[PDB]
């Protein structure tokens, strides 16, 4: 029907939820993708459907790289067409994030599949599927990282995956421009800190941020996604907007 | 009375005009700075005042580097406070743009004063005067250039000024973040081309743009300015948003 | 006495010029190869005629798989076996071909080759090299000066070269404590793909500001030699373009 | 004969180590200086004692003004007068001090010194160099920290950003004349004379590769590479020589 539709990956919680909520408030129908967070995904879709019925569905998939990842990414895009008859927007938000020291219970090949698959390869396959299933304001927004050039110690694979995501953003903006598909990124600095992190460590990171000495709210991240998908960004493609309160400008 | 106020330099025509219009449509009172274009600046102020009385004034100043530039820039900022009692937004838009070949009727020192004054020095002095004078959403937007790393041939002084403006955007974002003043840029690729440029040459440039094979409208550039000054960008500082249709991604 | 270097993809073209120039500088070299056995041995024979027992070959497929970590460990081990030390790693081997987003290897094979060979193998080699460690230890990654203005329909290739920039910076930071420097060399057009038409080749040569020609392989190798030398002992996390200005040229 | 190089601000510290190392490589040198007349003439004496007639000094103020173009023309002229050629220009001279946005020198003077020395004088020297024209090249001393700048150094940071633009624009424009243009970007090298030793140590401790500043010689080594025949295909490149400092997050 006549409301546009969006896919948001890793949308059960945290930033991906804030993006799906804000898209839904702007008038989109949404596919809430999730991996393990089944209860949180269904609860969000229920909340959205209560606000406007038949406007949210969930879709489960592991985005770890394997020989079936192309099928799973094809299926995520397929689920948006099955529910809503169209797919206007793809938000690549799902991400694995953990250290992989170079000088050192997962195997290294599992670490590569997870950190490179979720951060880079699944975005590429979803982009291919999104583009191939096209028949309006079509675009993709990749969630990138403002600190990719000043990386955390011992996170090489995660950093490699986020750099690859910058290259995807640029390559796909170039190649999909003739189809009228825009491809942009939003690059948080510190936003919602990891659930595992102690308050004392959270505050150490907060104190580094020039603009307010605090992390970004999930909603502040979502605001920049909403801008890039909007008609106010219709000439914008291949741009990555930092939303980092100045953190990347701060020297050691 | 409770409306915020903005200074836009070089606002009589083209991009600066569209930025002043869009700020006014959003509810800002505006200072329309101009250098030579008196009749166009006053025409715009009159059109805006017809929409809402006493919401637009003009301010004449040459932004060429000289001994008097600091006083001129102080006076532009002062004009905003005298008209409207506050100054919430500064837009550094005014720009000289012409070739300065390295190998061979203005002298080179005049080219330096104009190209480095308008593009860099005047922004710095206006940023100083804006900050010295300071519900609040204070910010500065500098009009940058998406092609600064792939410059037009024989434009070294222009390119130097626009790189210096990147540095200003970054340095002032860091330094003004404790005052709650955000500093950002918008970087066009090809937007409004010269009226007197032959269509055949205009088309050579338009054909290079992946997204639509056309230049950006002034309004499309103004849209990204409006985003950055808005409450939707309240964690964004030190960022430069390209608005270039993918132009900067295209190899030779 | 003499230091030792591993050069991946060293049988031909750029990696060959790198191995030769390292050898000429006094390194012992491990010439890695995948399919190019005859050429790898040919170069080792040429080097060993110059100084005996200074060049060995090492076969390995650098495609991503469950066995890549073991293959990468073996490349590094081969250097230690032959020469008792490994001072320099040059990650030069690379797959290069288009992978259009909008439509034969399967996609997941193109991922294994383009991301495995250009990024994951460099990462695992870097891990094996650091694990096995006065001296001047460093790693040099063969990057691409055109990574921000990529060729149309080369997304996987571009992703892998961007990942290789991130590896260069992450490993430079993490290995600095061990005195291991990590840097890159980023060619523009050098030796054009054998596949490529002559007409397409001249089209590209014409774009290059500095002399309207491609880099020779030895011009690339010159920047590698600089980065491994004692004249670069404070340089880590740097990527030196060697592109004749190509990446400065607008559309 | 031997090639000739101009090194601006060559009396002391990094510019001095660059002049020494070019001279050791074979070059005749113009040692440009502003205030450091004793140190300039003393280096030139040292170099000439090694090889007679291979070093001269040239005094000039690189502050921006309507006579800066004549002064930069004079610097290039002095190389031609002494040596009959000018193969290499090193833009090393630089003013460096804070210019806070929120409040001895007027702001017009701070702009003229920080933008003139770091950017305008390089541009004018590049113009004069190119206009008077084997292995010709220019090397600009940039700054590895330009995107993670010191607090309250906007004018300095603006100048160094402009110098990056100059390096790119001049590389593009001079390539058809066979002139290469590149940069060397130190992180922390010889720390300011004015700085206390506790602040010097805070900076040293930030550097991943060795927890120490670059020697002036290590900066000069990269300059030597870029002017050498081993960098003949290199133009528009800026080499960081920063021990990883620019990689370290806040
Ligand atoms: N939070 C920050 O400060 C910050 C900073 C920089 C960049 N970012 C970027 O912003 C985005 C969102 O940040 P965030 O903190 O909201 O992310 P997050 O909570 O770390 O992860 C978001 C979701 O990713 C999904 N995910 C993880 N591994 C997966 C797999 N193998 N298959 C499928 N899905 C998987 C998970 O879904 P389930 O829970 O359903 O398993 C998870 O809820 C990410 O791209 C991130 O890298 C965030
Ligand atoms: N148009 C494009 O494609 C494009 C591309 C990249 C970047 N940009 C940037 O976007 C901004 C707006 O572009 P535009 O094409 O609208 O600019 P423009 O028409 O070239 O110039 C804007 C105004 O700048 C003012 N200006 C010029 N020299 C001045 C001086 N010495 N003192 C004071 N004001 C002076 C002039 O005002 P008066 O007319 O009143 O004298 C002029 O109308 C500029 O910063 C530009 O560099 C534009
Ligand atoms: N040529 C250029 O203009 C250019 C431009 C930009 C960047 N570069 C970078 O420069 C480096 C060298 O360039 P080049 O033109 O010399 O490279 P190339 O000829 O395309 O490839 C070099 C060698 O890489 C090895 N290789 C490819 N796939 C492999 C796999 N799955 N397993 C193991 N080895 C494999 C091959 O070795 P075998 O032959 O033994 O099978 C090949 O001979 C590359 O990293 C490249 O991306 C080159
Ligand atoms: N040292 C570092 O850590 C570091 C870090 C990043 C970048 N850099 C860059 O590397 C280069 C060399 O560094 P450095 O520490 O050796 O420089 P420095 O000691 O601060 O300055 C070099 C020389 O510049 C000259 N100079 C200053 N103002 C001048 C003017 N108005 N006219 C003419 N000359 C003037 C002075 O010459 P006289 O003494 O003859 O007056 C001075 O000796 C500079 O471009 C610098 O910005 C250095
Ligand atoms: N998928 C995700 N990507 C990222 C990227 C960055 C951050 C973030 O919070 N970074 C600050 C941070 C800094 C250091 C450490 Cl050790 C940790 Cl665990 C977290 C958190 C996340 S969650
Ligand atoms: N103050 C101004 N700054 C700029 C910056 C860039 C452009 C612009 O037109 N860029 C594309 C372009 C189009 C045509 C020609 Cl001939 C050239 Cl040199 C450049 C136009 C302007 S007007
Ligand atoms: N392993 C390798 N990596 C690279 C990277 C770039 C090039 C190169 O020649 N690029 C220019 C170019 C690349 C692709 C095409 Cl289709 C055309 Cl026509 C021209 C060649 C190679 S070989
Ligand atoms: N002409 C010159 N340019 C530069 C650029 C940077 C440095 C340097 O010392 N940077 C480190 C540093 C710079 C400024 C301060 Cl306030 C402190 Cl504490 C530490 C020193 C110089 S001297």
Coordinates of C-alpha atoms in Angstrom, one line a residue, chain A residues 101-104, chain C residues 73 76 80 124-133 175 178 180:
Chain A
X101 CA 43.8 -9.3 20.2
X102 CA 46.6 -9.9 17.6
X103 CA 49.0 -11.3 20.3
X104 CA 46.9 -13.8 22.2
Chain C
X73 CA 51.0 -19.7 10.1
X76 CA 55.5 -17.2 8.6
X80 CA 61.7 -19.0 10.6
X124 CA 46.2 -13.7 10.0
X125 CA 49.7 -13.2 8.7
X126 CA 50.1 -10.2 11.0
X127 CA 48.9 -12.3 13.9
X128 CA 51.4 -15.2 13.1
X129 CA 54.2 -12.6 12.5
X130 CA 53.6 -10.8 15.9
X131 CA 53.1 -14.0 17.9
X132 CA 56.5 -15.4 16.7
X133 CA 58.4 -12.3 17.9
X175 CA 52.0 -3.7 17.8
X178 CA 56.6 -4.6 20.5
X180 CA 56.7 -3.7 15.2

